[PDB]
Amino acid sequence: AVPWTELLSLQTEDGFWLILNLNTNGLHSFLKQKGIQSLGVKGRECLLDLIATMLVLQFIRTRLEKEGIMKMDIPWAFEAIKQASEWVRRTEGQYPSICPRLELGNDWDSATKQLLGLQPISTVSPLHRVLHYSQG
Amino acid sequence: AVPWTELLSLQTEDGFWLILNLNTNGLHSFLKQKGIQSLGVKGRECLLDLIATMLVLQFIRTRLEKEGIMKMDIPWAFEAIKQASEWVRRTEGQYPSICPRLELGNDWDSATKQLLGLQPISTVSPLHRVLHYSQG
Amino acid sequence: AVPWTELLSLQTEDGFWLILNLNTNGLHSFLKQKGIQSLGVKGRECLLDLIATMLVLQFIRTRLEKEGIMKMDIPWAFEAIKQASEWVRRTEGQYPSICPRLELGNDWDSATKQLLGLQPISTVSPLHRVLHYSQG
Amino acid sequence: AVPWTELLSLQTEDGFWLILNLNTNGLHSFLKQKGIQSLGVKGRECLLDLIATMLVLQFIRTRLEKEGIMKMDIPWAFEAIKQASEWVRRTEGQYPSICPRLELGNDWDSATKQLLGLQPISTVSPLHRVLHYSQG
Amino acid sequence: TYIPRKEVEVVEIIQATIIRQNQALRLRARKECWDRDGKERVTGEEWLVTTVGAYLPAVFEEVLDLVDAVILTEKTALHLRARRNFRDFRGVSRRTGEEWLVTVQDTEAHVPDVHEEVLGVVPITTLGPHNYCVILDPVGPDGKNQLGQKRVVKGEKSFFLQPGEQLEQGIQDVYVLSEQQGLLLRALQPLEEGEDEEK
Amino acid sequence: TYIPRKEVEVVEIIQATIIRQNQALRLRARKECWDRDGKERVTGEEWLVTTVGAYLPAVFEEVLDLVDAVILTEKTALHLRARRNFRDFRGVSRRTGEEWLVTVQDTEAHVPDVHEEVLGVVPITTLGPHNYCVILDPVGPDGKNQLGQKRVVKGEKSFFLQPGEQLEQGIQDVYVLSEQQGLLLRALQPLEEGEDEEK
């Protein structure tokens, strides 16, 4: 019973991304420590929009695969998922091996599952305060 | 439930910037100490309008990324954000490395997150009395 | 909720300046000590009108920057601010380094913030009785 | 709430000057001691009208600068202030250095502020009984 | 790995940017320094770096944005105002405000310098064997537009409208006439037209 | 870093300004001093500094505003009243109130001095081969406008209206006449017009 139309009300003009239930503040202060400022002002907004769009796509794929049913491109919301996947697959080639170097996982499937909160996070990983600062 | 139309009522004639919930007095007395008078009368008003416009853009980006969705340029307020981003990207080149030299952070993403108040401020940093003088 | 139209009712014929909430008497007796009489009868009225116009502009800029939004030139009062800024930028060149020599600060941004009362005043400075003689 | 129209009812035919709230008797007996009779009968009336017109102009400038807004020349009383300033600036050149020699201050700005009563009067100065003989 | 020290403090953990092929990276100075090529840079001075791979910035260098080269087909050229004095990749001296064009015979791809301004992409004007055109303000042998004049171009020919020039009334078609058709036409100025042997 | 002292007090922490290329910085004196070039300055005297980079002021120098040079294309010139006596970059002596023009043949970019006043940008007047114009108050060989007179300019020609001059009725077009057309025209003053051999 997640908001579906309310996501498309917040759909951006190009294809980039409460309705997510995630610590926003805490994630921005986490990425502030890792050195996102050194990628340029233009670069950090592109990277944050990339990570937000991957988070929305992982939320969509989690919503779909509970009923069983870059490759993700219902017929009524197929257009937004198609243009979001095309926005993902273009700007991802600018950043090879960016989820290890930003300390989020192996690849984007490992990163978005940990950031969404359905998969465990190890003690050797510093991603323990992204779900627990919202618990405080 | 932030005021949206009330910001556009306070929109300036060129594209520069309560509705912000920040110590104004205290920030001006903070920047008075660091030597903003030596940049010229014309220069200090341009710099203060730059910092206010970056603060409004960071407030907008914080409002957007809680729902997930210089690079920032809703369709109904796209014009003001576009002209504000064009006003930012023109006069920023006059000031290289200005946020370290004014003691606000590494770059503008590090500076506006600390000045807005969602990210921590270290003890080695003198930005502790910009959020606590409003608490007194 | 400051009086806005009541300022334009007190707008002078050329562009020079309760509605200010400042010790008038005390400021005039302060400037009487520093030797304003030696600048000529014509000169001291020009300087007092300059300082009053800078005070009104600083009050306007304080009113604007609480909502976030010589360089200062709302659309309905843009004409008076424009002609006041043009009156400021013409006669300021007659007086280089006048705020140190009259013991008011480094420049006009340092002077009007102390005279308005939102910024601290040091003990080495004689500007302590301009806000406290009104408290007595 | 000073009488404004009641001053123009007492406006003289050439441009020279209760509504002032000042010891008249005491000021005339003060100037009688200093040797105003030796300036000629015609001369002393011209000097007294000069000092009264400067007193009215200082009262006007005090009334204006509490709201912030020879150089003094509201639109409705601009004509009387203009002709009074032109009457001042003509006959002032007859008397160079007259306020020291009559023991009233450095110049007219120092003299009218002390005679009006808003600025302090030193013990080395004999102007202490012009405000206190009205208190007795 | 990094072993710490008492008198040395770690400020931040900077991350490289990835310059792909046919791109470049613009990055200014924050302080009077030298770059990796070993050239002096004043504060605020911007420049481009054109090495492919991960590019790690220096401590004073700042990364502003990535720039991608423009691809020039035979039917397009590149209109470029100059921003100040420099010498381009071909090695000719430019001056402030000077405009020119870049074609395929120069390079297949051009990455726009920080001393240049992309004004737009100029598509080729092509004339058939039955077409002609009149160029307003043509460019003479000194490279400067001859104001006020005109020039009539006819034939199977294709070319670029250089900056300053303009077509008068578009691509026009030539008057072919049968022997039952004639043209009445007036002279504006004294002329000489020797189509045949006579004049 | 700064180690303090008992008899020395830190007044403020001044910050440099960044002069980019094709700019300049205006800064006056607060006291009789010398500048970085080593020239005497009286109080209130303003001047310009044209070094690119971070420019740190001195203790008496004040930074008022940044000035940017104007770019001069072939179709624009620069109208400049003088403010007082000086010698410009070309090295000619000006006088107070004297006006003149700057063209591309002087410089591609001109940063307006503190001893000059930008009155406006003068676009070029261009005449076609079918156009003429009448200049009111033309400038003679002594550089001074000849008041009251006129001058008729005709042909494929482009030029700038120098200060003082004015076009009478705009760009006018010449009278071409067939052999079925004639003009009646009166003489205002005794004249001589030898178009052909006779007079």
Task: State the method.
Answer: cryo-EM
Beta bridge partners of E175: none
How many distinct helices (H) and strands (E) make up chain C?
Answer: 6, 0
Element (H, E) at F82: strand F76-82
Residue F191 burial (CB count, 10 A)? 6
Q: What is the CA radius of gyration of chain E?
A: 27
Kindly determine whether residue F18 and residue B96, on different chains, have CB atoms separated by under 8 Å.
Answer: yes
The gap from C-alpha F131 to its chain's centroid, in whole angstroms, comes to 27
Structure tokens at E72: 């020039």
Kindly determine whether residue F178 and residue E189, on different chains, have CB atoms separated by under 8 Å.
Answer: no
The gap from C-alpha F21 to its chain's centroid, in whole angstroms, comes to 20
Task: Tell me the CA distances in angstroms from D6 to D13, D25, D51, one per residue in order.
Answer: 15, 21, 20
Please provide the DSSP assignment of E94-163 as one string. Answer: E-TT-EEEE-TTT-SEEPPPTTEEEEEEEEPEEE-TTEEEEEES-B-TTSSB-TT-EEEEESSEEE---B
Instruction: Compute the distance between CA of residue B101 and CA of residue B104 in angstroms, rounded to an integer.
Output: 8
Contact F11, B33 (CB under 8 A): no
How distant is the Cα of F132 from the closest Cα of chain E, in angstroms?
12
Instruction: Compute the distance between CA of residue A91 and CA of residue C29 in angstroms, rounded to an integer.
Output: 68
Structure tokens at A101: 């170097």
Residue C88 burial (CB count, 10 A)? 21
Kindly determine whether residue C97 and residue F30, on different chains, have CB atoms separated by under 8 Å.
Answer: yes
How distant is the Cα of B99 from the closest Cα of chain A, in angstroms?
12
Top residue of B36, B37, B38, B94 to mutate, by most chain F CBs within 10 Å, is B38
Residue E180 in 3-state DSSP?
coil
Q: What is the CA radius of gyration of chain C?
A: 15
Burial class (CB in 10 A: 0-12, 13-18, 19+), D36: middle
Instruction: Compute the distance between CA of residue A102 and CA of residue A98 in angstroms, rounded to an integer.
Output: 6
Instruction: Compute the distance between CA of residue F6 and CA of residue C23 in angstroms, rounded to an integer.
Output: 36
Kindly determine whether residue B96 and residue E12, on different chains, have CB atoms separated by under 8 Å.
Answer: no
Please provide the DSSP assignment of E9-41 as one string. Answer: --------EEE-TTEEEEEEBSSSEE-TT--EE
Contact F55, F17 (CB under 8 A): yes
Q: What is the CA radius of gyration of chain A?
A: 15
Q: Do chains E and B touch (3 or more CB pairs under 8 A)?
A: yes
* Phi, psi at D54, each rounded to 5°: -65, -35
Contact F44, F12 (CB under 8 A): no
Instruction: Compute the distance between CA of residue E109 and CA of residue E21 in angstroms, rounded to an integer.
Output: 11
Which stretches of chain A sit within 8 Å of chain B by CB? Answer: 10-13, 16-20, 22, 24-25, 28-29, 32, 36-38, 41-42, 44-46, 48-49, 52, 55-56
Top residue of F30, F66, F84 to mutate, by most chain C CBs within 10 Å, is F30
How distant is the Cα of B16 from the closest Cα of chain C, in angstroms?
6
Contact F15, B36 (CB under 8 A): yes
Instruction: Compute the distance between CA of residue C118 and CA of residue E30 in angstroms, rounded to an integer.
Output: 33
Kindly determine whether residue E44 and residue F72, on different chains, have CB atoms separated by under 8 Å.
Answer: no
Query: Closest partner residue to C106 among F12, F28, F29, by Cβ?
Result: F12
Top residue of E31, E32, E83, E115 to mutate, by most chain B CBs within 10 Å, is E31
How distant is the Cα of B110 from the closest Cα of chain A, in angstroms?
7
How distant is the Cα of C84 from the closest Cα of chain F, in angstroms?
18
Residue A136 in 3-state DSSP?
coil
**For C101, which residue in chain F has the nearest alpha carbon?**
F30
Structure tokens at A31: 């990425």
Resolution of the experimental structure, in angstroms: 2.9
Q: Which residues contact F129 (CB under 8 A, 6 or more apart)?
A: E148, E149, E188, E189, F155, F156
Structure tokens at D28: 């005339």
Burial class (CB in 10 A: 0-12, 13-18, 19+), E198: exposed
E148 touches chain B (CB under 8 A): no
The gap from C-alpha F89 to its chain's centroid, in whole angstroms, comes to 12
Contact F116, F82 (CB under 8 A): yes
Residue E81 burial (CB count, 10 A)? 17
Residue keyed to tokens 């930074």: F63
Kindly determine whether residue E62 and residue A102, on different chains, have CB atoms separated by under 8 Å.
Answer: no
Q: What b/e string do you get for B30-46 counting C-beta neighbours within 10 Å, with b at 16 or more? A: bbbebbbbbbbbbbbbb
E168 touches chain F (CB under 8 A): no
Instruction: Compute the distance between CA of residue B81 and CA of residue B68 in angstroms, rounded to an integer.
Output: 18
The gap from C-alpha A10 to its chain's centroid, in whole angstroms, comes to 15
Those chains having 3 or more beta-carbon pairs within 8 angstroms of chain B are A, C, E, F
Residue E115 burial (CB count, 10 A)? 19
Residue keyed to tokens 């990796």: E36
Task: Tell me the CA distances in angstroms from C111 to B91, C63, E138, one per residue in order.
Answer: 27, 17, 60
In a 13 Å sphere around the CA of B44, the CA atoms on its Cβ side amount to 22
How distant is the Cα of B63 from the closest Cα of chain F, in angstroms?
34
Please provide the DSSP assignment of F157-182 as one string. Answer: EEE---BTBEESSSSEE-----TT--
| Per-residue DSSP letter, E6 | S
Top residue of A2, A9, A23, A24 to mutate, by most chain B CBs within 10 Å, is A24
Instruction: Compute the distance between CA of residue F2 and CA of residue E193 in angstroms, rounded to an integer.
Output: 86
Residue E106 burial (CB count, 10 A)? 14
In a 13 Å sphere around the CA of D105, the CA atoms on its Cβ side amount to 21
Q: Is the dihedral of CA F26, F29, F30, F36 positive or negative?
A: positive
Top residue of A12, A55, A60, A94 to mutate, by most chain B CBs within 10 Å, is A12
Instruction: Compute the distance between CA of residue B117 and CA of residue E125 in angstroms, rounded to an integer.
Output: 58
Structure tokens at D126: 């004999």
Name residue D45's amino acid: E
Residue keyed to tokens 């200062």: C72
Structure tokens at A135: 């618990």
Q: Which residues contact B67 (CB under 8 A, 6 or more apart)?
A: A10, A18, A19, A20
| Per-residue DSSP letter, F124 | P
E10 touches chain A (CB under 8 A): no
Contact A56, E37 (CB under 8 A): no
User: Nearest-CA neighbor of A79 among A2, A1, A8?
Assistant: A8
How distant is the Cα of C89 from the closest Cα of chain F, in angstroms?
10
The gap from C-alpha F185 to its chain's centroid, in whole angstroms, comes to 41
Q: What is the CA radius of gyration of chain F?
A: 27
In a 13 Å sphere around the CA of C16, the CA atoms on its Cβ side amount to 19
Provide the angle, in degrees to the nearest 10, between the axes of the packed helices A24-33 and B41-65.
120
Instruction: Compute the distance between CA of residue F11 and CA of residue F145 in angstroms, rounded to an integer.
Output: 56
Instruction: Compute the distance between CA of residue C100 and CA of residue F43 in angstroms, rounded to an integer.
Output: 14
Residue E77 burial (CB count, 10 A)? 22
F62 touches chain C (CB under 8 A): yes
- How close are the terminal C-alpha atoms of chain B, in Å? 26
Instruction: Compute the distance between CA of residue D52 and CA of residue F12 in angstroms, rounded to an integer.
Output: 47
Instruction: Compute the distance between CA of residue A82 and CA of residue A15 in angstroms, rounded to an integer.
Output: 9
Instruction: Compute the distance between CA of residue B120 and CA of residue B109 in angstroms, rounded to an integer.
Output: 13
Q: What b/e string do you get for B78-116 counting C-beta neighbours within 10 Å, with b at 16 or more? A: eebbeebbebbbeebebbbbbbebbebbbbbbbbbbbbb
Residue E81 in 3-state DSSP?
strand
Which residues in chain E touch residue F22, judged by CB atoms under 8 angstroms apart? 83-84, 96
**For C99, which residue in chain F has the nearest alpha carbon?**
F30
Instruction: Compute the distance between CA of residue D12 and CA of residue D70 in angstroms, rounded to an integer.
Output: 19
Structure tokens at B113: 């997150």
